[PDB]
Amino acid sequence: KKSLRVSSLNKDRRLLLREFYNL
Amino acid sequence: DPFQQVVKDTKEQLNRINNYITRHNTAGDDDQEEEIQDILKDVEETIVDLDRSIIVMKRDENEDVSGREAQVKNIKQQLDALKLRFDRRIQEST
């Protein structure tokens, strides 16, 4: 067994995405 | 800052796969081959998110556009370096 995916990356992507309209 | 966080997540994701390729030279595990292809796709799309963020943020009187697009350029170069390693590696056997 072997694990390549980085923890928190989907969650950080969602924060960046949620900022997109913020004006 | 969420943008800087993604920029960091991505470099580190890219590096993780790079290190894996270095340790498992052999183009084997169909699992990880799929998984690597899945992650790399996710990264292509993450870079569109970062680019998009910059474009809509160009009016924002603080934001460092040129310093940010320079960080995205760098990440594109890193992804492209690794897509090459991966492609080269596939042509090596079995």
From Swiss-Prot, chain A:
This is Vacuolar protein sorting-associated protein 51. It comes from the Eukaryota. Present with 319 molecules/cell in log phase SD medium. Belongs to the VPS51 family. It comes from Saccharomyces cerevisiae (strain ATCC 204508 / S288c). Transmembrane segments: none annotated. Component of the Golgi-associated retrograde protein (GARP) complex, also called VPS fifty three (VFT) complex, composed of VPS51, VPS52, VPS53 and VPS54. Interacts with the t-SNARE TLG1. Involved in retrograde transport from early and late endosomes to late Golgi. Links the Golgi-associated retrograde protein (GARP) complex to the t-SNARE TLG1, leading to the fusion between the endosomal vesicles with the late Golgi. May also be indirectly involved in apical bud growth. It is found in: Golgi apparatus, trans-Golgi network membrane; Endosome membrane. The chain holds residues 8 to 30 of 164 of the full protein.
Curated annotation (Swiss-Prot), chain B:
GO terms for molecular function: SNAP receptor activity; SNARE binding. Residues 1-94 are annotated as: Interaction with VPS51. Residues 30-94 form a coiled coil. Its main location: Golgi. Phosphorylated at Thr-26 by TPK1 and dephosphorylated by SIT4. Palmitoylated by SWF1, which prevents its recognition and ubiquitination by TUL1 and its subsequent degradation. GO terms for biological process: endocytosis; Golgi to endosome transport; Golgi vesicle fusion to target membrane; intracellular protein transport; retrograde transport, endosome to Golgi; vesicle docking; vesicle fusion; vesicle fusion with Golgi apparatus. GO terms for cellular component: cytosol; early endosome membrane; endomembrane system; endosome; endosome membrane; Golgi membrane; late endosome membrane; SNARE complex. It is found in: Golgi apparatus, trans-Golgi network membrane; Early endosome membrane; Late endosome membrane. It comes from the Eukaryota. The modification Phosphothreonine is found at residue 26. Keywords: Coiled coil, Endosome, Golgi apparatus, Isopeptide bond, Lipoprotein, Membrane, Palmitate, Phosphoprotein, Protein transport, Transmembrane, Transmembrane helix, Transport, Ubl conjugation. SNARE protein (of Qc type) involved in membrane fusion probably in retrograde traffic of cytosolic double-membrane vesicles derived from both, early and possibly late endosomes/PVC (prevacuolar compartment) back to the trans-Golgi network (TGN or late Golgi). It has been reported to function both as a (target membrane) t-SNARE and as a (vesicle) v-SNARE. Upon vesicle tethering to the target membrane, which requires additional proteins, a SNARE-pin is formed. Belongs to the syntaxin family. Interacts in a SNARE-pin with the SNAREs TLG2 (Qa), VTI1 (Qb), and SNC1 or SNC2 (R). Interacts with VPS51 of the VFT (or GARP) complex. This is t-SNARE affecting a late Golgi compartment protein 1. The chain holds residues 6 to 99 of 224 of the full protein.
